[PDB]
Short mmCIF file of C-alpha atoms in Angstrom, two decimals:
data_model
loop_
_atom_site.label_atom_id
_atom_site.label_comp_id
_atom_site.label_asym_id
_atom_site.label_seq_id
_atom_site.Cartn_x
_atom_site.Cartn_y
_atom_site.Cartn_z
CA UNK I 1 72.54 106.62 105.41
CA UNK I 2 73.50 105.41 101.61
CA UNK I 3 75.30 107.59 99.61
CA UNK I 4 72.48 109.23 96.85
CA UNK I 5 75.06 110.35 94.44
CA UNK I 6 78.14 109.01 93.12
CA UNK I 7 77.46 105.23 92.89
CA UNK I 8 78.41 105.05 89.11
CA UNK I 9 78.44 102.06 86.63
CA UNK I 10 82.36 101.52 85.91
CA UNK T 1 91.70 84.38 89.92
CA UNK T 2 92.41 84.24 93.36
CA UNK T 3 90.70 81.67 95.24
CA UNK T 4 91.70 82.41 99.25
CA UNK T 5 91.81 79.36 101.71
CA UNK T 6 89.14 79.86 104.71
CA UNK T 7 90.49 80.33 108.70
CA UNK T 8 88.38 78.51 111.07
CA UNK T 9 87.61 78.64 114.63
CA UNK T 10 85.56 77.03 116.45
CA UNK T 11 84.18 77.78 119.96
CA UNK T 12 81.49 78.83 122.53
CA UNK T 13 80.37 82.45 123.13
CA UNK T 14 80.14 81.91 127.41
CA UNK T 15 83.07 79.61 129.38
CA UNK T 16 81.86 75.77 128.96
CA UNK T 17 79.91 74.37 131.62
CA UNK T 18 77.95 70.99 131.13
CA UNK T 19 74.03 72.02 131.59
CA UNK T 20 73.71 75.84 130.68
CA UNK T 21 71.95 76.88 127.62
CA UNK T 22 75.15 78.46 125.51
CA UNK T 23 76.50 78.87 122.03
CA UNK T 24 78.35 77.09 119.43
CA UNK T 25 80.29 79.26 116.72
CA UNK T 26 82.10 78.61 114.07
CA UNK T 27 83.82 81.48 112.20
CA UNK T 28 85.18 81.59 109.01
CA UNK T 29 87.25 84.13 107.54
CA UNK T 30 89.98 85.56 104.86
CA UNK T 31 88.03 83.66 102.19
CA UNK T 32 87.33 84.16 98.23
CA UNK T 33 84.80 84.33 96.48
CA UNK T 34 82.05 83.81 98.60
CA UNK T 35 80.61 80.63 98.01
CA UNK T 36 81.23 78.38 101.26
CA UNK T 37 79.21 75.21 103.11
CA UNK T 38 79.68 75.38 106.63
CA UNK T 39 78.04 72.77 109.21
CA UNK T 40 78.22 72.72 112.62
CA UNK T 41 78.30 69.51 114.06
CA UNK T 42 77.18 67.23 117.18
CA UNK T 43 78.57 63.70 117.39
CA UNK T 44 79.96 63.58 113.84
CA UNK T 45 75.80 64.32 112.45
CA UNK T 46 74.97 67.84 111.12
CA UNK T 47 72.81 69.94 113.42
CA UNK T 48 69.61 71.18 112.04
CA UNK T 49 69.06 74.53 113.82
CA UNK T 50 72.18 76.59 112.50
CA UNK T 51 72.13 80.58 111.49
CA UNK T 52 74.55 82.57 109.91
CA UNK T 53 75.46 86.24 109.84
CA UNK T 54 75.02 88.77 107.44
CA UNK T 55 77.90 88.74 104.55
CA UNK T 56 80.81 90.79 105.00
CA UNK T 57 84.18 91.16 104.12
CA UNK T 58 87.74 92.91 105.31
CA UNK T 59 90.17 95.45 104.16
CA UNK T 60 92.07 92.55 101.71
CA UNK T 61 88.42 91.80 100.29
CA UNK T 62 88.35 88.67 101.73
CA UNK T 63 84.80 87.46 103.37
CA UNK T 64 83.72 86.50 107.03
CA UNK T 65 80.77 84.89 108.55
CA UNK T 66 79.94 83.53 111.51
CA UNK T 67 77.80 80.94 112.29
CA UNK T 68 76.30 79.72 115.27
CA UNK T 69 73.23 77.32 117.11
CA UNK T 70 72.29 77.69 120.51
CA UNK T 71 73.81 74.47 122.18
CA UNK T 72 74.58 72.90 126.15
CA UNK T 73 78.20 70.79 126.63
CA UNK T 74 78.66 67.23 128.15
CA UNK T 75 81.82 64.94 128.76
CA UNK T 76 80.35 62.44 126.11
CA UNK T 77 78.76 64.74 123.48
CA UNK T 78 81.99 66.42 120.94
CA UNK T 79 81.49 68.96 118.60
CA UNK T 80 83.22 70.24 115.53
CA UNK T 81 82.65 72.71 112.74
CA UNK T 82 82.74 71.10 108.97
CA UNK T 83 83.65 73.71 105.86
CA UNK T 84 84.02 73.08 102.31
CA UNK T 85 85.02 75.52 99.70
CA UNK T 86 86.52 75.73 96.39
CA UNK T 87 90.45 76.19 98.15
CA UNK T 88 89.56 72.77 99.76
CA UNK T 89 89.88 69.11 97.71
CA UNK T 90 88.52 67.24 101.44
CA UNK T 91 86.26 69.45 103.81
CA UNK T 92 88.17 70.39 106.96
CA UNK T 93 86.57 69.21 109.91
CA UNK T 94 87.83 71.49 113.20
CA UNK T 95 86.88 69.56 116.47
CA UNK T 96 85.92 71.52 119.21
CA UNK T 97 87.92 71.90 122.44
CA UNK T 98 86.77 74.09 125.28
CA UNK T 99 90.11 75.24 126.05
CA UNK T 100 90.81 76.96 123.03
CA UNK U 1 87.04 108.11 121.26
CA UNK U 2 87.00 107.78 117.28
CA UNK U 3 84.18 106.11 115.13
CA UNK U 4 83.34 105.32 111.81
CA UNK U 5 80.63 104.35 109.41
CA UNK U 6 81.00 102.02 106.67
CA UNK U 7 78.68 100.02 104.00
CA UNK U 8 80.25 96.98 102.48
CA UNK U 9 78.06 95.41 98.96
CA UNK U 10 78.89 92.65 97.89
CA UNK U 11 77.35 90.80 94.40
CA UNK U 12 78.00 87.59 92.57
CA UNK U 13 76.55 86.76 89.19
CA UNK U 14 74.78 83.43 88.88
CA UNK U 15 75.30 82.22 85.34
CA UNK U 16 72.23 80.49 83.31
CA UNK U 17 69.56 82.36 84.67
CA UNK U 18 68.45 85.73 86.55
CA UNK U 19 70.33 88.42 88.24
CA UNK U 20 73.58 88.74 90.68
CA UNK U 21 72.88 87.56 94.30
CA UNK U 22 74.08 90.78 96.12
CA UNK U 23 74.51 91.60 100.02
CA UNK U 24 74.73 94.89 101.47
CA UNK U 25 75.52 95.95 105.27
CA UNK U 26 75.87 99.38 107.00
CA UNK U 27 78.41 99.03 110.03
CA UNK U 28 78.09 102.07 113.03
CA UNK U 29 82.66 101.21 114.39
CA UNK U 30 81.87 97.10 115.46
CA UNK U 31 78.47 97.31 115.35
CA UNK U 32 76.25 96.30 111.99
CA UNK U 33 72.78 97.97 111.92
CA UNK U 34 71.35 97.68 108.57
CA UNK U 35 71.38 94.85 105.88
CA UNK U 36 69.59 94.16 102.30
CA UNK U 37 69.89 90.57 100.87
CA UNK U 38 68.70 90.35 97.23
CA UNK U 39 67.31 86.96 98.32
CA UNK U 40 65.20 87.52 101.39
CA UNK U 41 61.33 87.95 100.93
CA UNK U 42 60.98 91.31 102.20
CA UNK U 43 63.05 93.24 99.78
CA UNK U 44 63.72 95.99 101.58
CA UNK U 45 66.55 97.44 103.71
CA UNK U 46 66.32 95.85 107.55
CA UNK U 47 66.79 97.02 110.71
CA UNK U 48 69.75 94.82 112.51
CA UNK U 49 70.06 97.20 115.87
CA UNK U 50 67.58 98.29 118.04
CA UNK U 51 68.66 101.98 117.96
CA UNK U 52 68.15 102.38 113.89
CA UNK U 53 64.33 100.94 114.75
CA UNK U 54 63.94 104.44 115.73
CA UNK U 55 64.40 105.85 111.98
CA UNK U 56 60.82 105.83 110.21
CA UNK U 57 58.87 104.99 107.35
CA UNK U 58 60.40 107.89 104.61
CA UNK U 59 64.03 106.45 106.35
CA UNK U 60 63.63 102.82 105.17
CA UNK U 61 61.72 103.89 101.84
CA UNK U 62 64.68 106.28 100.98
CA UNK U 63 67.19 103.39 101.94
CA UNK U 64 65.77 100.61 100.09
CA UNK U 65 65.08 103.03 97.44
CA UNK U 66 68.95 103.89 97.26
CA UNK U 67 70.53 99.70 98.10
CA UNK U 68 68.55 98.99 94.90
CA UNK U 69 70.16 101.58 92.98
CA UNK U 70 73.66 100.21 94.05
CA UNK U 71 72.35 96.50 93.46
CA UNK U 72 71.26 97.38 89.52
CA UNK U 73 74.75 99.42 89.11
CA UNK U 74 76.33 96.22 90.30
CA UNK U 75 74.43 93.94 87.89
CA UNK U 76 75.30 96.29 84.73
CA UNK U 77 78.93 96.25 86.59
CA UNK U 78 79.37 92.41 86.32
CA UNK U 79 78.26 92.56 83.13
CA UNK U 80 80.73 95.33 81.91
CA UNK U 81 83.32 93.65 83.78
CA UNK U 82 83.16 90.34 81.97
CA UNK U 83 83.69 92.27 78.56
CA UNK U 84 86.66 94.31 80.02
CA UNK U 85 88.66 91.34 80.76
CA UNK U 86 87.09 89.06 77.92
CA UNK U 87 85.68 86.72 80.63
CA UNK U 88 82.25 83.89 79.28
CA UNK U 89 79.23 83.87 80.23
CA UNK U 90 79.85 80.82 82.14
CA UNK U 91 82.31 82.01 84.80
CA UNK U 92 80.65 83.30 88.43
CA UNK U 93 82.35 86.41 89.63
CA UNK U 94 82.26 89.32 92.09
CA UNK U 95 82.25 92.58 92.76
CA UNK U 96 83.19 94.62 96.10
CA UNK U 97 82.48 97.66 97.21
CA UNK U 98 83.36 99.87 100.68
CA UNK U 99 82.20 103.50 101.43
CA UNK U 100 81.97 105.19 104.63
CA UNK U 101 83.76 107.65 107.16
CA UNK U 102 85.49 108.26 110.00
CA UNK U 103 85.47 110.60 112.85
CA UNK U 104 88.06 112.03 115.66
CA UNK U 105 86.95 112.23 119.58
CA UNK U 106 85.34 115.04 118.99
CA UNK U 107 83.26 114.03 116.05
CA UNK U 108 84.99 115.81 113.06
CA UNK U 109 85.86 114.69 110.07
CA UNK U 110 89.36 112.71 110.06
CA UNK U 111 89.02 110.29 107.01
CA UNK U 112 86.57 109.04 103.85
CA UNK U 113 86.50 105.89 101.90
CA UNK U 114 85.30 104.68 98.60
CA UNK U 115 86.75 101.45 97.35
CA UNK U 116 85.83 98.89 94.78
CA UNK U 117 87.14 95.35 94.05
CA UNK U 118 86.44 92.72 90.86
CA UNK U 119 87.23 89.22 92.08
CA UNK U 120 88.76 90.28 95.06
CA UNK U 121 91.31 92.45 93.72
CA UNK U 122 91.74 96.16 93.67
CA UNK U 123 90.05 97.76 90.90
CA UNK U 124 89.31 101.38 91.51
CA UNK U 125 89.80 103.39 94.82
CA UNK U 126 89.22 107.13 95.78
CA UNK U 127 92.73 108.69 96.93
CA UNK U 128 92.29 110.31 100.69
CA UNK U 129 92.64 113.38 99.24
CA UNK U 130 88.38 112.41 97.48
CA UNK U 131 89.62 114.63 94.57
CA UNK U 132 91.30 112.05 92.76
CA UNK U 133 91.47 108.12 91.54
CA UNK U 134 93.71 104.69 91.98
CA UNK U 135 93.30 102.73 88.87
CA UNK U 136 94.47 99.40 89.45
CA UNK U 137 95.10 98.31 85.48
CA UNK U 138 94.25 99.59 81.87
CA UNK U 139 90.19 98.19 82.51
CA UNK U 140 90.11 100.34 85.81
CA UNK U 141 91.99 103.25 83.54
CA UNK U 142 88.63 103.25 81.48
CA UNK U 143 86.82 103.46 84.66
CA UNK U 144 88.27 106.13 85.85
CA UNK U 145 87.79 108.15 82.84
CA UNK U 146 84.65 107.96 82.71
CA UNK U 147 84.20 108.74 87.03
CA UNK U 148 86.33 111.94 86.14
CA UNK U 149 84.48 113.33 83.26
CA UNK U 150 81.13 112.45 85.21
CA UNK U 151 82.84 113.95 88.37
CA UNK U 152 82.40 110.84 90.55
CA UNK U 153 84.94 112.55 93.02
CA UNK U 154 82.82 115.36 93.65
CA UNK U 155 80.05 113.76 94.70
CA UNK U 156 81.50 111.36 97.01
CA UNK U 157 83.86 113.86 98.69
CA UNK U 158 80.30 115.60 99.56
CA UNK U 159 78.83 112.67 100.66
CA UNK U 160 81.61 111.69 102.63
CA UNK U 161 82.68 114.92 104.25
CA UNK U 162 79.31 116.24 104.87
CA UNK U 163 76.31 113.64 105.20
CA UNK U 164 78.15 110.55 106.24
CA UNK U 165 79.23 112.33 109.49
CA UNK U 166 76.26 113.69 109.96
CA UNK U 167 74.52 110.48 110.03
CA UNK U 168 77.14 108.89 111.86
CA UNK U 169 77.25 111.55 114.36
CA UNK U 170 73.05 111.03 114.87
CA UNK U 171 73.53 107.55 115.14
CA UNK U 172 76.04 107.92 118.04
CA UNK U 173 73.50 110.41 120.17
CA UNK U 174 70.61 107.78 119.27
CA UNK U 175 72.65 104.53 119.75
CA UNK U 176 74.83 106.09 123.04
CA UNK U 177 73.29 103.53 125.54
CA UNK U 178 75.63 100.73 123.36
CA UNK U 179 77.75 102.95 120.81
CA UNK U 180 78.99 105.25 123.31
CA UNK U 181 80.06 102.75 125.65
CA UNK U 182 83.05 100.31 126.17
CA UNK U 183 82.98 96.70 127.09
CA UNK U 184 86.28 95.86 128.99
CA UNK U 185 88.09 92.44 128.36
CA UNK U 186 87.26 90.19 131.09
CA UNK U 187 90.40 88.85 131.42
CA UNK U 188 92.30 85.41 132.79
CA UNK U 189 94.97 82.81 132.29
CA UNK U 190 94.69 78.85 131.54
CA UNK U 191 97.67 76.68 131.85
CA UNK U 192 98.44 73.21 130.21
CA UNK U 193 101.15 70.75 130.63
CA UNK U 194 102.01 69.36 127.17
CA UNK U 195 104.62 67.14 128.54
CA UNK U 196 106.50 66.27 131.72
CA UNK U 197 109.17 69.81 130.75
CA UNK U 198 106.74 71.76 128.34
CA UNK U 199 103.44 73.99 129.52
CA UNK U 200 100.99 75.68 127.33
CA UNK U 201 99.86 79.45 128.94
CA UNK U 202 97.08 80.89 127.65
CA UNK U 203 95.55 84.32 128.19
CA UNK U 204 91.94 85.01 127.31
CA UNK U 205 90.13 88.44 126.46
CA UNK U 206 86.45 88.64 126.44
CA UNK U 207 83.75 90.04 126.34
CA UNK U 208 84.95 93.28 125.00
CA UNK U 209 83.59 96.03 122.71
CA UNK U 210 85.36 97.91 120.69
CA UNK U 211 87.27 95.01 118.93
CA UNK U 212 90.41 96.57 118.51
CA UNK U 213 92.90 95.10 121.55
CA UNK U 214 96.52 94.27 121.76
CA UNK U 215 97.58 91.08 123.95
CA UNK U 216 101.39 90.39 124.35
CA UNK U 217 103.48 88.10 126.58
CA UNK U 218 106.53 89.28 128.58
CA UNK U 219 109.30 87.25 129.88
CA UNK U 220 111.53 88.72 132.66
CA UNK U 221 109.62 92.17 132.20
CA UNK U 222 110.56 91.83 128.42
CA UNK U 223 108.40 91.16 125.00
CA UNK U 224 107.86 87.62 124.02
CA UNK U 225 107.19 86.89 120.39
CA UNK U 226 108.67 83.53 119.96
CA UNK U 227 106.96 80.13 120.96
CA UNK U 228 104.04 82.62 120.84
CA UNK U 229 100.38 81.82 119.09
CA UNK U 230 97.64 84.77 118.73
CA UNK U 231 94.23 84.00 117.49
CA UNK U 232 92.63 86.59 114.97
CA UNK U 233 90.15 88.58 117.37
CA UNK U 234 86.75 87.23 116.97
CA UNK U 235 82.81 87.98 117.54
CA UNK U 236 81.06 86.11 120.08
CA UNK U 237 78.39 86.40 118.97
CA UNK U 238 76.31 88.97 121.08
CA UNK U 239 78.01 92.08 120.18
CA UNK U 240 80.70 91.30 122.04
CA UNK U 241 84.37 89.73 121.10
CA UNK U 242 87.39 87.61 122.50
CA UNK U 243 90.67 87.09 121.80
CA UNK U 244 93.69 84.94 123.22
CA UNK U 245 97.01 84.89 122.96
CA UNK U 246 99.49 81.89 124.02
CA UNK U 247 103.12 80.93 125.32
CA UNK U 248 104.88 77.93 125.65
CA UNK U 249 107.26 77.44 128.34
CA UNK U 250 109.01 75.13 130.19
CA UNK U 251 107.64 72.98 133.01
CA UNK U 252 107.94 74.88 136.61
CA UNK U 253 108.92 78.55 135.08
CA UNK U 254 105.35 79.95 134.56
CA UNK U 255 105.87 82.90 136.76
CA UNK U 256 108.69 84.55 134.67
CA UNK U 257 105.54 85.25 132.30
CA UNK U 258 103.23 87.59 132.21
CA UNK U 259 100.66 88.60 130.28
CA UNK U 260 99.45 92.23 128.79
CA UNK U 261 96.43 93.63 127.82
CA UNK U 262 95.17 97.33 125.96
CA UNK U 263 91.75 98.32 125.29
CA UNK U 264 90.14 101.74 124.90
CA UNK U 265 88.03 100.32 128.17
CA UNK U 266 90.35 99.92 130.36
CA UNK U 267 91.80 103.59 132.11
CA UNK U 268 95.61 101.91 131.72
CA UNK U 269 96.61 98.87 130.61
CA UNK U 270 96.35 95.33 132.37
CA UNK U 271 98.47 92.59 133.91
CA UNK U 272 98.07 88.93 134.14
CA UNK U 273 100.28 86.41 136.02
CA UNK U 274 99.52 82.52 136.85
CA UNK U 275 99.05 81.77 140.37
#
């Protein structure tokens, strides 16, 4: 599964 | 930017034998950006019928795909995988060759 | 042996109207089972192995749900990007990114991943220790500012340590029948005569699954790099791969050569001579 947490905007 | 030159190969997924229903591929890799026109070809005209995987790309960021049509050798028939992409002034044209 | 799990997304603006075209595939080792393409009709995330089909409905919401996420991200990304490195609005350009895990023979975690290109150059990447940052230049500096004070690291190194293996590891037990087993290199040689004093010998791999291999000549019982060609291992197509490697040699001497192969598949490695 995707990663929920950590995909930031840079 | 960098703008990376495309590898091609071209070839069949089973050992060519004139009347069995196989597969034509041509894969292209170590490529950037993305954008790329790839035809496969039978007798120097563009076949119809031709899928592609999904986009992906390697450790160096560079992008592969493979495409492919479901295809059946002869002596006469010759086929060859046609690419353009920004890296390239004159599409390369890679003949096929059921030895390699 | 070991496995991994990885998700590569790739997007690329389109300048003049509308948002980024942007790809996204989830890899189980060799094997891709999931995809979302910003351009198909279905918009959602897709099954691409039989063994995934398994997942249900609350699965695929949650995914699609979560490759969206990444895909807006992505778009505001681009856009940030351009202003970094005082790109126009005309230009096309992409970003890259690769998460995922990997896992020893017995499952556990060995490694995590979370890199991110801009044009096909490193940007930002998470240090193996996941507690810390590579910053490529002064734009990526920024970035990583910003990931630390909103402890990016943190997050990820959960992710990564904890659920990624655990999905991985529930994908192996559901995919076994495939993902558990090894396809061994059906090997053999081809010969051709360039010339009346010159042959070409070629040995083939095929078939095989994982695509890691190693094929090297010998001469005498010793390693053969020169007049030597290898071809970059490749995907036939059905889940399977091939790869050959190739020695010139003079006309009548084709039995000093010989030819060896190493896959996870076979118990010890193989031999190859021409008859």
């Amino acid at each position: 599964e995707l990663a929920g947490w950590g995909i930031l905007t840079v | 930017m960098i703008q990376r030159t495309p590898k091609i190969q071209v070839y069949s997924r089973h050992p060519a034998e004139n009347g069995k229903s196989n597969f034509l591929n041509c894969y292209v890799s170590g490529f950037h950006p993305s954008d790329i026109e790839v035809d496969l070809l039978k007798n120097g005209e563009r076949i119809e019928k031709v899928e592609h995987s999904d986009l992906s790309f390697s450790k160096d960021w560079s992008f592969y795909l493979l495409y492919y049509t479901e295809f059946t050798p002869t002596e006469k028939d010759e086929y060859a995988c046609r690419v353009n992409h920004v890296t390239l002034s004159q599409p390369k044209i890679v003949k096929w060759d059921r030895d390699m | 042996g070991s496995h991994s799990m990885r998700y590569f997304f790739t997007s690329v603006s389109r300048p003049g109207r509308g948002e980024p075209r942007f790809i996204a595939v989830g890899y189980v080792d060799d094997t891709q089972f999931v995809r979302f393409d910003s351009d198909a009709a279905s918009q959602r995330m897709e099954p691409r192995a039989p063994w995934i089909e398994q997942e249900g409905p609350e699965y695929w919401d949650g995914e699609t749900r979560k490759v969206k996420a990444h895909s807006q991200t992505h778009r505001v990304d681009l856009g940030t990007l351009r202003g970094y490195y005082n790109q126009s609005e005309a230009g096309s350009h992409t970003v890259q990114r690769m998460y995922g895990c990997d896992v020893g023979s017995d499952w556990r975690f060995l490694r995590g991943y979370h890199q991110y290109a801009y044009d096909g150059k490193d940007y930002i990447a998470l240090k193996e220790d996941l507690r810390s940052w590579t910053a490529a230049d002064m734009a990526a500096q920024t970035t990583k500012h910003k990931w630390e004070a909103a402890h990016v690291a943190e997050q990820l190194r959960a992710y990564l340590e904890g659920t990624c293996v655990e999905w991985l590891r529930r994908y192996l037990e559901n995919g076994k029948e495939t993902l558990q087993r090894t396809d061994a290199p059906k090997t053999h040689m081809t010969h051709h005569a360039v010339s009346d004093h010159e042959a070409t010998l070629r040995c083939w791999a095929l078939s095989f699954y994982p695509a890691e291999i190693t094929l090297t000549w010998q001469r005498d019982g010793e390693d053969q790099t020169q007049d030597t060609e290898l071809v970059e291992t490749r995907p036939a197509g059905d889940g399977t791969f091939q790869k050959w490697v190739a020695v010139v040699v003079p006309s009548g001497q084709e039995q000093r050569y010989t030819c060896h192969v190493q896959h996870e598949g076979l118990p010890k490695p193989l031999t190859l001579r021409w008859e």
